[PDB]
Amino acid sequence: AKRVAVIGAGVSGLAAAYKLKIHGLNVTVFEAEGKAGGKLRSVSQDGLIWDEGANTMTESEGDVTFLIDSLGLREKQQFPLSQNKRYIARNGTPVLLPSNPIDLIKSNFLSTGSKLQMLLEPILWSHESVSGFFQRHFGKEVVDYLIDPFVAGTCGGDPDSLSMHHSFPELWNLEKRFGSVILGAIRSKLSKTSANKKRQRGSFSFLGGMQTLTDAICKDLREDELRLNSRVLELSCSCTEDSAIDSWSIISASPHKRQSEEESFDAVIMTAPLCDVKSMKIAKRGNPFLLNFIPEVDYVPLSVVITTFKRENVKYPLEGFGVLVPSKEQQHGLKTLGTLFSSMMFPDRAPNNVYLYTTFVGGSRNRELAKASRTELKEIVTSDLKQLLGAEGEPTYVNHLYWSKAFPLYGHNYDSVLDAIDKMEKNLPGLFYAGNHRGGLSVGKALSSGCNAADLVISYLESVS
Amino acid sequence: AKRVAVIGAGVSGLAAAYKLKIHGLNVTVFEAEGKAGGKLRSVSQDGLIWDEGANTMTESEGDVTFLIDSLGLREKQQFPLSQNKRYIARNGTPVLLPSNPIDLIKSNFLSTGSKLQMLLEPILWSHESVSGFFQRHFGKEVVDYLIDPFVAGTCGGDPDSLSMHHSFPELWNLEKRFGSVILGAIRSKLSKTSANKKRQRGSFSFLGGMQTLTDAICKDLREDELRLNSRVLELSCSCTEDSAIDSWSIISASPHKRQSEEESFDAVIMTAPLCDVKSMKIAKRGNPFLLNFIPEVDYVPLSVVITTFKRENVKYPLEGFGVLVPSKEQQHGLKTLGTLFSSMMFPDRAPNNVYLYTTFVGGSRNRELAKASRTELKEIVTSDLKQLLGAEGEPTYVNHLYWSKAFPLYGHNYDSVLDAIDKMEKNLPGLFYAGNHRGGLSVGKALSSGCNAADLVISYLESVS
Ligand SMILES: Cc1cc2nc3c(=O)[nH]c(=O)nc-3n(C[C@H](O)[C@H](O)[C@H](O)COP(=O)(O)OP(=O)(O)OC[C@H]3O[C@@H](n4cnc5c(N)ncnc54)[C@H](O)[C@@H]3O)c2cc1C
Ligand SMILES: Cc1cc2nc3c(=O)[nH]c(=O)nc-3n(C[C@H](O)[C@H](O)[C@H](O)COP(=O)(O)OP(=O)(O)OC[C@H]3O[C@@H](n4cnc5c(N)ncnc54)[C@H](O)[C@@H]3O)c2cc1C
Ligand SMILES: Cn1nc(-c2cc(C(=O)O)c(Cl)cc2F)c(Br)c1C(F)(F)F
Ligand SMILES: Cn1nc(-c2cc(C(=O)O)c(Cl)cc2F)c(Br)c1C(F)(F)F
Ligand SMILES: CC(C)(C)CC(C)(C)c1ccc(OCCOCCO)cc1
Ligand SMILES: CC(C)(C)CC(C)(C)c1ccc(OCCOCCO)cc1
Incomplete structure (x- = not known):
């Protein structure tokens, strides 16, 4: 009987915990907050x-x-x-707002210079910001009243401080290949x-409410499955000895009322924000495992x-x-x-x-x-x-x-953030991260990184033999 | 004892005679030539x-x-x-040639100039030939080395003497509504x-060969169904008297029988070309129908x-x-x-x-x-x-x-040709035309006009209280 630790009871952690249970594996979910919803x-x-x-x-x-x-x-x-x-x-x-591309050129929502710059985009066309990219391609009006409202409605962020590469992957690619966004988009979407x-x-x-989804997953977890108010403080994985796959132990607080405790597991799915992984005392063999390399995400x-x-x-x-x-x-x-x-x-x-x-x-x-x-x-x-x-x-x-x-x-140095998440996953076996600082920020995406984390844990616990 | 005569054994006629047969109706097909193939x-x-x-x-x-x-x-x-x-x-x-319109801008088939006029077409934009339309919209190069080869490959005709309206219906409409081809197409190309x-x-x-299709239909039409060399010379429909739905008698010639011959039917599907319908002595009650003014199509x-x-x-x-x-x-x-x-x-x-x-x-x-x-x-x-x-x-x-x-x-006065075909049909009851001077010149289309002619007859066969 293998056991998997899941830090975080958000849609991602619950997704991972669920995909895990329906496959036998006994699971334990630590949740810092008093309620399960993420x-x-x-x-x-x-x-x-x-x-x-x-x-x-x-x-x-x-x-x-x-x-x-x-x-x-x-x-x-x-x-x-x-x-x-x-x-x-x-x-x-x-x-x-215009419902479809056509109305964009057919309405007055855009200036005469913006339409011409769009239509001629097929001919006229590292750390680039969402803002820069779109600016040079379609103009300022289109960055100010189109892509900006879109980013504001997705994360409340600002176009000028978002990696174009990391924010719109489906488009960074097309430019690399096809070179002109308008043409590429057409190529694909117009001709698991x-x-x-x-x-x-x-x-x-x-x-x-949206919480209904989260609750449904929780009704399949015992009171011992879901541990609320039990915030994870430290992680420790011991190797060698007489066995095989390393062993992880979790030190979460509020074991009662201002108390501390521990437990040993075979794998651990990390779901808390990257800024919370930092404030976690994690150690390898016997000596600490410094997360210094973790860039500071805003x-x-x-x-x-x-x-x-x-x-x-x-x-x-x-x-x-x-x-x-x-x-x-x-x-x-x-x-x-x-x-x-x-x-x-x-x-x-x-x-x-x-x-x-x-x-x-x-x-x-x-x-x-x-x-x-x-x-x-x-x-x-x-x-x-x-x-x-x-x-x-x-x-x-x-x-x-x-x-x-x-x-x-997802800022400038976000190309490096991803590297750290991978460096960590490679140097500390069994530990799998599945936050939303990777796949993307949307219920749907986190949900998927949760599932994908569960069966990653699965083919690791079974690679043994 | 429902008699349905179909004049012409082309794909259109054979399609019509087939659709008929699998719905009871006894059929007879007159084919001027020695072999069925249209x-x-x-x-x-x-x-x-x-x-x-x-x-x-x-x-x-x-x-x-x-x-x-x-x-x-x-x-x-x-x-x-x-x-x-x-x-x-x-x-x-x-x-x-660019396989699909989109490499039409990446490829060098067209000039940079011809792409500018094209891309900006959305902004810069009764009879009127295929040639005139396309000329004013996309330029001469596109007419000369694109839409012309196309017309040449479809009927061996010339862009300058083809009704834009009649040749490209799916495009004459879009201009009427949307106003700019390019924009329209986009709103209709991306609407077992x-x-x-x-x-x-x-x-x-x-x-x-293409004839194999024609032959498959012929192996499902008994000897009394297909009459070869039996070219139709005259038509005659009698009304009044004691019965109902008018009559229809065909006078087709022969060479291995000499003289001529006649037969009576309830409906008649015309399939020979409009230039052949003219050389057909057809009469209404007792007095002729003449034709000193047929739309002499070229x-x-x-x-x-x-x-x-x-x-x-x-x-x-x-x-x-x-x-x-x-x-x-x-x-x-x-x-x-x-x-x-x-x-x-x-x-x-x-x-x-x-x-x-x-x-x-x-x-x-x-x-x-x-x-x-x-x-x-x-x-x-x-x-x-x-x-x-x-x-x-x-x-x-x-x-x-x-x-x-x-x-x-499909020339200039082709807007009037269609009128005559309808005048003839709305006039002489039971008679339905289904050549290729209407639906479009392609095996697929004529095949359809044949089918659609058959169940039109079937409606006339019915619609009798
Ligand atoms: C205001 C707002 C509106 C949004 N609107 C939409 C929308 O309309 N549509 C859409 O698709 N997305 C929307 N999102 C995004 C979506 O909610 C998130 O992408 C998704 O919930 C992230 O899920 P998660 O499970 O990865 O993380 P989270 O939901 O952040 O959960 C992580 C969990 O980790 C726990 N945790 C942290 N530290 C520890 C620790 N040390 N020990 C134990 N547990 C710990 C936390 O308490 C938390 O429950 C919105 C987000 C916000 C904030
Ligand atoms: C050279 C050529 C190449 C083509 N290539 C293609 C191609 O690659 N792809 C494509 O989709 N289309 C192609 N087409 C077009 C397509 O083949 C035709 O539109 C279609 O076959 C027309 O069918 P139809 O039944 O209307 O007429 P037809 O096939 O002409 O048949 C009408 C019938 O009427 C009969 N008839 C005439 N007068 C009498 C009479 N007095 N009594 C009895 N019977 C009579 C004729 O003998 C004939 O069999 C091509 C056409 C031509 C000429
Ligand atoms: C998450 N969210 N959703 C909207 C939002 C989105 C839409 C939409 O188009 O889906 C609309 Cl209409 C209004 C909003 F306020 C906004 Br501004 C935010 C944010 F990031 F600021 F919290
Ligand atoms: C019927 N037909 N087909 C072609 C033709 C068509 C294609 C095609 O586009 O499929 C090609 Cl590659 C070559 C042809 F010769 C030509 Br030019 C003609 C005509 F009208 F002259 F008789
Ligand atoms: C690939 C996509 C569809 C994700 C993004 C593209 C660049 C096409 C985009 C980007 C922005 C945009 O603006 C509409 C504002 O509505 C906010 C909706 O949340 C419309 C489309
Ligand atoms: C809707 C159509 C297919 C009638 C016409 C359009 C404008 C799309 C067109 C017109 C011309 C054209 O040129 C290619 C030549 O191909 C010879 C095929 O017979 C390609 C497309």
Whole structure:
């Protein structure tokens, strides 16, 4: 009977733990926090249902489809009732975003010089930032009101400080080969097998919030499987002796109330953020194993603010999923990142005579705004909501959660970060990392790095013989 | 006792007569010529196997796939063994053509200038010839070395005398709506077998020639079904009296029977070319129908010449399906329209130590060439094959067939031609036309117009309370 340690009870760790159990292996999951949900955190209150973390997800990954079926969550899968229409703030007011490439050249959303620069992109065309790349290829307007809002809506980050290579792999490649983005994209998408049937390829959630997914995985784990409040402090792997595959031991705190303890395992799946792996006393044989080589990864800080206005006071409502605020719009009074039209997407999340708005504040464009008092946050949100949707008066209700490290910032030296994760995995056998600082930042992707970590542990525990 | 006469045993007629038969309806097919084959005409002699008519076909039509299955011709369906690569004669020599429109900008088939006009087409952009349209939109080079070779390869016609509207419907529409071809195409190009598509697309044939299809339909039509040499001379429909659905009597001639003959039917599917319908004494009640004003449609004349050179004498062979000769290449010594690489596509069609070349001569660019003597034709073909493929000496073998009316020329007044076909149909009840002067000139299309004509008859057969 082999045992596998899994540090972190986020969607990634739960994915890994689940894929592990259904294959016999006995598992133990250490969770620093008091609740299992990872960045997936749904809350239920006074006639409201909201997500303080991930709000939606997609199944572009085989593993997502697989899990949705295993746990039997199809009936709980919830799609938006509202049309898929996103808006961008331009000069300080919502403008409808173009649904497809054609409308881009056919509408007025772009200047005459931007369209010509796009159309002629096929002819006119290491550490490059998302911003630089797109700039030289399609122009500034397209970086400011298109790719910027997109990055803001994905991690709340800033185009100027993201590795183009690491952020958009599917595009860095095409340039290397084809040389001109426009041409490449066309080449491919215009000329792992699981179930599904291209049925509702859009995004979606689950009745009750994104946390429903995480809970489903937890109902298959015993109280001894899932150890909450037990944050991992140290790791230790002993080799040699009389046996084979090395042995790992975990020192987690709160063994009770301000207590410490240990346990021995055969493999360990690392799922906590890279900035948390650093503050972990890990040792090889008998002498420490210094993580000095771990580059210092930065994070996008931001808080999710929830507000609710009586429909009678929202002068200019918009139909769709929400509004993104281009960092350039700060010079127009808009201080938030963007806001989702929650009750419009999921009307059950609130009373039919009110609007539920999930707003994101802070981000790379303004870190000291994520840490504002609920009051200060309350006004920031109202202020933008007034100017964007014509929201009149006070929020009727306000709540929020602050994430000091919401998303990993795939920066310049991110080419080296990956190297360290690999150096660590190579020098400390049995240890497999599967955070979201590798595969990508999205429920779906982390889920996959979790599964992929589990069967990596599996063919390692079985390579023995 | 439901009598259904189909005039003409071409693919269209045979398709119609087949669709009919498998739905009860007794049928009779009059075929002016000695052999059933329509424009489909295979010849299997001298270790050679060639087609004097249609050489290849496609199943972009549902009816084509249906027929291939009913008659069970899948095993006889034959695809080219050579790579789908076509060449264009330029300045005097073959030039590989871009397989799919996208290498059309990476490749050097077009000038930088011709790409600018193309890429910017989205911004810069009753009758009007195929030539005029394409000219104003993409430039002269694209008309001369792209859309012209295309038309030459489809009907041997000339861009300057073809209705843009009637020739390319799928494109005349997009301009009306979207306004700029390029943009439109993009919004419509990216809007049961295992190798279905690759086969659904990509032209093919059948072991033994295109005629094999025609023959499969003929082995399912008893002796009383197909009447050869029995050319239709007059039509006559009687109404009133004691019954219902009008009558239809055919007066077809004979040579081994002398005089003539008659027969009565309930419906009549016209399949002969519109230029033949004119030379048909047809009458309504008791008084004629005359025709001192029929849309006298013109035709593209041309002959299919067959030659065969010993491989040892073909200096510069090319891999692919063939070569197309832009009409502008006449000022360079090339007098032909194009030639297929017959034994390369189908190596079973000839001895492995020789090359079988199917060349088309004449066409709109030179009518008095399609009527040349086999000798004069033997030289013309040789002359071009030398300059194009480095063919040395005489053909080793020569044969040919001359079609004085190979293809219907969809000219200017073709908007009115269709009106007459409908006037005739809405007029004389029971009579349905289904030639190739309507649906389009290609085996696949005519086959469809035949099927669709059959169940149209079936509706008329019914629709009787
Ligand atoms: C505000 C916000 C909104 C988002 N919205 C979306 C969205 O709409 N769509 C989408 O696809 N993605 C969204 N995401 C991203 C998505 O939520 C994450 O990619 C995903 O949850 C990451 O999962 P994970 O399991 O890798 O990590 P996490 O969820 O971060 O979990 C890691 C776990 O490690 C535990 N841990 C840390 N240190 C220790 C230790 N020493 N010992 C034990 N346990 C430890 C933590 O407590 C935590 O539970 C959003 C993220 C945020 C922050
Ligand atoms: C040289 C050449 C090459 C071609 N190559 C290709 C190719 O590679 N790919 C492709 O897709 N298409 C090709 N085509 C086009 C395609 O073959 C034709 O569009 C199609 O065969 C037309 O079919 P149809 O039934 O309308 O007419 P036809 O085949 O002409 O048949 C009409 C029938 O009417 C009969 N008829 C006429 N008058 C009378 C009368 N008075 N009484 C009784 N019967 C009568 C005729 O004898 C004939 O059999 C080619 C055409 C030609 C001429
Ligand atoms: C995670 N998230 N989602 C949105 C967001 C996304 C969309 C979308 O298009 O999916 C919309 Cl409409 C509005 C948002 F606020 C934003 Br600004 C953020 C972030 F990163 F700031 F926290
Ligand atoms: C019917 N036909 N096919 C070709 C032809 C077509 C292709 C092709 O594109 O498939 C090629 Cl490579 C060579 C030809 F000669 C030509 Br020029 C003709 C015509 F109209 F002149 F009789
Ligand atoms: C390959 C992709 C589809 C991931 C990214 C590309 C560059 C095409 C892109 C990038 C940005 C973009 O802007 C729309 C803003 O909407 C935010 C939605 O979250 C639209 C497309
Ligand atoms: C929709 C079509 C296929 C009718 C026409 C378009 C404009 C796409 C076209 C037109 C011309 C063209 O040139 C290639 C010559 O190929 C000879 C094949 O008979 C390629 C494509």
